[PDB]
Structure formats: structure tokens, C-alpha cells
């Protein structure tokens, strides 16, 4: 499990060489954002249950077959697992967002999820549609002021959406 700071060091040991000054002002800029990144993860972890429940409700108002009798979302049990599978991906997307690198997301969330969903008969495309609906609500909730200083956050919400798309293409 790496953060974005450990990435450049793990590529520096490999060549066996010191970080040159261009990598250093690439990193001091990363530090110099800093507060924006944690404002982003603060906004996602403050509203996590709302994100998950609204995305699941939109998913079943859209695809009623999962809650149809015989569906993969039928009954209390299957539904309880589906409710917080999405909350697992939201948790690991927030971990990867605070780390600056999608290393924890690939290690312990997306590693082997595809044949896990294949071995159960779970339709991975509907999981991907649920991931996309969580993504849309998270980027919508990320760029509001809500009592923060005005500025641009665009390079951070692009990375936040990229983590969601990385999770969405790896499941299916």
C-alpha cells in the first residue's frame, strides 16, 4: 500500500538514485494543495449513507429486475450485501483519494472482485452502473463552497472521478 509520496521513492530506489529537484517541486506543489484534498474527502465521508442509499434507490427505480422475485437483489439478505458492497467501494475510493494513488484501491478492493462476482452470478454491469451513480453524486457534492474559501478544485475532482472509473471498469 503506497501513497503518492511513496510512489516516487519506490521508483527512485529502483534506479538507485536521489530525487532530483524537479521531483521535489512536483511534490511541494502536491503538499501545497493539501487542504483542498482533505476538504474533498471530508465532504464525501460526511454524506456517505446518503450517497449510497440514493444511488441504490435510483438503481432499483431504474432496474426493477434486481428486486423482482428471483432477482439478484431479491430478499432482505441479498439486499443487505448489495447495500454495503457499494459502501465498500466508496470507502476505498476515499482511501485512494486521501492517498493520492490508486494502490490501496487495487490491492484490497478491486483485486479479484471480477471472478468473485462471476462465481456468485452477480451481474457486474449493474455494479458498474451503481458505481457510476455514486460517482455522479460524489462529484456533484464535491464542488460546492458550503463555507470554504473560493477557488478551483478541478484537478482534484478529475482524479476523484478517475478513481471511480477505475473501480467501475475493473468490476465488470
Amino acid at each position: 500500500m503506497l501513497d503518492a509520496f511513496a510512489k516516487v521513492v519506490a521508483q527512485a530506489d529502483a534506479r538507485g538514485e536521489f530525487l532530483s529537484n524537479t521531483q521535489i517541486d512536483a511534490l511541494s506543489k502536491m503538499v501545497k494543495e493539501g487542504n483542498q484534498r482533505l476538504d474533498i474527502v471530508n465532504k464525501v465521508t460526511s454524506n456517505a449513507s446518503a450517497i449510497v442509499t440514493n444511488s441504490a434507490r435510483a438503481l432499483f427505480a431504474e432496474q426493477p429486475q434486481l428486486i423482482q422475485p428471483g432477482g439478484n437483489a431479491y430478499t432482505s439478505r441479498r439486499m443487505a450485501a448489495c447495500l454495503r458492497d457499494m459502501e465498500i467501494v466508496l470507502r476505498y475510493v476515499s482511501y485512494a483519494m486521501i492517498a493520492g494513488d490508486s494502490s490501496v484501491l487495487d490491492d484490497r478492493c478491486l483485486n479479484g472482485l471480477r471472478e468473485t462476482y462471476q462465481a456468485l452470478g452477480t451481474p457486474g454491469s449493474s455494479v458498474a452502473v451503481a458505481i457510476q451513480k455514486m460517482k455522479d453524486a460524489s462529484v456533484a457534492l464535491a464542488n460546492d463552497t458550503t463555507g470554504t474559501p473560493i477557488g478551483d478544485c478541478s484537478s482534484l475532482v478529475a482524479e476523484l472521478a478517475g478513481y471511480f472509473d477505475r473501480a467501475a471498469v475493473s468490476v465488470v
Binding site: 500500500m1 503506497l2 511513496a6 510512489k7 519506490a10 521508483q11 529502483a14 534506479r15 538507485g16 494513488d101 494502490s103 487495487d106 490491492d107 478491486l110 483485486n111 479479484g112 471498469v169 475493473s170
Partner: peptide, 26 residues
Amino acid sequence: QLAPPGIPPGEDARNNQSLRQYVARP
């Protein structure tokens, strides 16, 4: 997509291995 099974992403040992002693990963 994802790294091979078991390999912790970002700290492979074959990173800067020479070609004269590189081993193909099964």
C-alpha cells in the same frame, strides 16, 4: 488493469532488473 495476484502494487522487484538476468513472470 490490476497487478498480478499477490504482487503489492507499486513495489515489484523486477522494476529495474537487467535484461541479461530478467526472469519472465509465470
